[PDB]
Amino acid sequence: KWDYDLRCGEYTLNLNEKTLIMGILNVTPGGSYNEVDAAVRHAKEMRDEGAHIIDIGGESTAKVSVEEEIKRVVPMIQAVSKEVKLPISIDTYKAEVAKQAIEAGAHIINDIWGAKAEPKIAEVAAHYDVPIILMHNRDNMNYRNLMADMIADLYDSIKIAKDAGVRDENIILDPGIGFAKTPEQNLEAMRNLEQLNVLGYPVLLGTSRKSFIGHVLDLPVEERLEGTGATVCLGIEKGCEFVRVHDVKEMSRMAKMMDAMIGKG
Amino acid sequence: KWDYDLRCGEYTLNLNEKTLIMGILNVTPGGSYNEVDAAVRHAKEMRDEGAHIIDIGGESTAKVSVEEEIKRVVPMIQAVSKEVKLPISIDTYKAEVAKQAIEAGAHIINDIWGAKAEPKIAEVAAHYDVPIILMHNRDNMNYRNLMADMIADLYDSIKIAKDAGVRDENIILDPGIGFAKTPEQNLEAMRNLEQLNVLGYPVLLGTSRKSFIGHVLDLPVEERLEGTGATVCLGIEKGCEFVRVHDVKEMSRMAKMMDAMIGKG
Numbered sequence: 001k002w003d004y005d006l007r008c009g010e011y012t013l014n015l016n017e018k019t020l021i022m023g024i025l026n027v028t029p030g031g032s033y034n035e036v037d038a039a040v041r042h043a044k045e046m047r048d049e050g051a052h053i054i055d056i057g058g059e060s061t062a063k064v065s066v067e068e069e070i071k072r073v074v075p076m077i078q079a080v081s082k083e084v085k086l087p088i089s090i091d092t093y094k095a096e097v098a099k100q101a102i103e104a105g106a107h108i109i110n111d112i113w114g115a116k117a118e119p120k121i122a123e124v125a126a127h128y129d130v131p132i133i134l135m136h137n138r139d140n141m142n143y144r145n146l147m148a149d150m151i152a153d154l155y156d157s158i159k160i161a162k163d164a165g166v167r168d169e170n171i172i173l174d175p176g177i178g179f180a181k182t183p184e185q186n187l188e189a190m191r192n193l194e195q196l197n198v199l200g201y202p203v204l205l206g207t208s209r210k211s212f213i214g215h216v217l218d219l220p221v222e223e224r225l226e227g228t229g230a231t232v233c234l235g236i237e238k239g240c241e242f243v244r245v246h247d248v249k250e251m252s253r254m255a256k257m258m259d260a261m262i263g264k265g
Numbered sequence: 266k267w268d269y270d271l272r273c274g275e276y277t278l279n280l281n282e283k284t285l286i287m288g289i290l291n292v293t294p295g296g297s298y299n300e301v302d303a304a305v306r307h308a309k310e311m312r313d314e315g316a317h318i319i320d321i322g323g324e325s326t327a328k329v330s331v332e333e334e335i336k337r338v339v340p341m342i343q344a345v346s347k348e349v350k351l352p353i354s355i356d357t358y359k360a361e362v363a364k365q366a367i368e369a370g371a372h373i374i375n376d377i378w379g380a381k382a383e384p385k386i387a388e389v390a391a392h393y394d395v396p397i398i399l400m401h402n403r404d405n406m407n408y409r410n411l412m413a414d415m416i417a418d419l420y421d422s423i424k425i426a427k428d429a430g431v432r433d434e435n436i437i438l439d440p441g442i443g444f445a446k447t448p449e450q451n452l453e454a455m456r457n458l459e460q461l462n463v464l465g466y467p468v469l470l471g472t473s474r475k476s477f478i479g480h481v482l483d484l485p486v487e488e489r490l491e492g493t494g495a496t497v498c499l500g501i502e503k504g505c506e507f508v509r510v511h512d513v514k515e516m517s518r519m520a521k522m523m524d525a526m527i528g529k530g
């Protein structure tokens with residue numbers, strides 16, 4: 001069904017056998033022992049609970065200067081990649097920040113502006129030959145047709161990536177749940193996820209604990225585990241390749257049950 | 266999408282607005298204060314956590330005499346229906362046991378042998394005018410074609426029900442997960458649930474904590490909450506009207522997230 005593995009330098013990710021789980025690493029503020037030590041323990045924990053990728057990045061949910069984001073995030077990567085044998089993605093949109101992260105040992109790029117923030121990032125991706133996640137986002141919500149416009153917008157990211165030298169096999173798409181979308185639009189995107197498949201790239205889904213779940217269930221962030229469950233289940237059934245979650249133990253067992261049932265693996 | 270409500274004597278169940286949750290009531294052995302009091306507290310708890318129906322019945326998972334099953338189950342129904350304002354289904358296949366249960370105040374019949382055990386049950390259903398759940402089951406597993414044979418077998422239950430006087434609107438079907446099916450056949454049934462829809466009746470799904478979940482996840486019964494989650498999510502996405510669960514709080518929030526997303530309600 002995919003005729004290629006996801007190549008991640010040291011590691012290799014097979015897209016046919018199971019839904020791959022990307023664990024969110026909270027960067028609680030760099031350099032200090034407390035910060036880097038708690039991040040390592042948390043990454044070790046996530047590896048133990050069934051995670052396949054560690055996603056390192058903070059400051060999205062402020063506007064910090066770039067030379068600082070590096071001071072924060074570079075030590076984090078050096079440590080985790082040394083002590084947790086697992087691919088690391090860097091969660092930034094900035095070109096200069098991404099460059100450092102791969103240099104410090106990070107394997108995937110995770111751009112929440114899908115190369116539209118700093119088009120030069122896609123050039124960094126092409127050069128180190130890393131896989132890149134292009135997320136749907138935009139500075140507004142004035143959609144003519146939600147799904148039609150997402151697919152259009154995503155394809156504009158691909159165009160920037162490909163004209164930068166990025167190979168098709170190093171491209172992952174993400175519908176960008178929670179970004180430039182009302183609670184009701186987020187549901188529609190979920191309902192229509194299977195459309196992104198026509199584009200012919202692997203899709204990552206990120207819905208973990210987000211507020212649209214709260215809006216439906218009327219429930220604060222620490223009570224959003226079951227809601228997340230449902231979004232991850234519907235996601236996988238709609239053909240997702242990756243899920244980005246906080247609750248690795250739980251989501252990982254759900255993915256596995258989903259895989260058994262849908263006939264994946 | 267359904268042009269009719271599910272009529273349950275005192276109560277009425279709408280099939281368009283939400284996935285309806287049936288809570289499993291464990292009958293731990295009748296008459297005694299401890300037994301009936303713990304059953305009532307457990308039913309009150311399930312009502313509090315989002316349940317829409319209470320399912321009362323034990324001895325399926327032995328072979329007890331009929332006049333005893335009544336001594337066990339009749340007091341349970343009198344109590345729960347008095348103190349929990351909710352429809353009760355009786356989980357039996359025996360005609361004489363069902364008769365008593367409705368007489369004691371129970372509203373739905375739940376037959377795990379789909380009128381094939383004691384065809385006379387369907388006559389009890391027709392007479393009191395209660396809804397009946399017909400489950401797929403058989404004394405063997407020698408399937409030519411799993412789904413084709415389920416649908417055939419189910420239709421044999423309907424034939425018995427309808428020739429007994431049961432109205433189409435009082436008929437609910439159930440694929441009978443865990444019954445006369447290997448772990449691998451259970452997955453296939455799950456994968457192909459949407460087929461039962463061609464028959465034109467509401468479908469209840471019962472997979473809560475069952476061993477096929479354990480077989481996939483390699484996990485004992487008390488660790489089967491996420492696995493159950495996935496089965497309930499895929500179920501609802503495949504058009505289920507009811508789910509039969511133990512973990513009402515959790516499953517109830519998942520159903521609700523599923524409903525929001527699939528556009529139900």
Ligand SMILES: Nc1nc2c(c(=O)[nH]1)N=C(CNc1ccc(C(=O)O)cc1)CN2
Pocket residue numbers: 060061091110111112133135174176177178179204205206207209210211212244
């Ligand atoms: N590839 C990828 N990266 C991310 C994603 C994401 O969904 N996909 N989400 C993130 C979290 N952003 C949020 C947006 C909305 C909400 C919410 O509405 O609660 C929470 C968090 C950041 N990084």
Ligand SMILES: Nc1nc2c(c(=O)[nH]1)N=C(CNc1ccc(C(=O)O)cc1)CN2
Pocket residue numbers: 325326356375376377398400439441442443444469470471472474475476477509
């Ligand atoms: N309408 C309906 N009634 C039931 C059902 C059910 O699935 N649907 N399951 C029940 C439980 N039977 C089990 C079968 C298999 C397993 C297992 O394999 O672990 C556990 C329990 C009894 N009553």
